[PDB]
Amino acid sequence: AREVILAVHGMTCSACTNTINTQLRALKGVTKCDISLVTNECQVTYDNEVTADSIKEIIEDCGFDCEILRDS
Numbered sequence: 001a002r003e004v005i006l007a008v009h010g011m012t013c014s015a016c017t018n019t020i021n022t023q024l025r026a027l028k029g030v031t032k033c034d035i036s037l038v039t040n041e042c043q044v045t046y047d048n049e050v051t052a053d054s055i056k057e058i059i060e061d062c063g064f065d066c067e068i069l070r071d072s
């Protein structure tokens, strides 16, 4: 496992960030998941089965604009 940062834009509320971290929690290969309305990134700890690639997509689908900014 490792951490990845998704820089995440659009979301600005508890409902959205809750919705986000909730989804990350419910993928497969996600160990930990800590979102921040301060930095406007989502930090997620993944193993292998799920990557920043899928995570990006999940996080986009939630209804916002994000990208894999960097590992951790």
Ligand SMILES: [Cu+2]
Pocket: 011, 012, 013, 014, 015, 016, 017
């Ligand atoms: Cu919102």
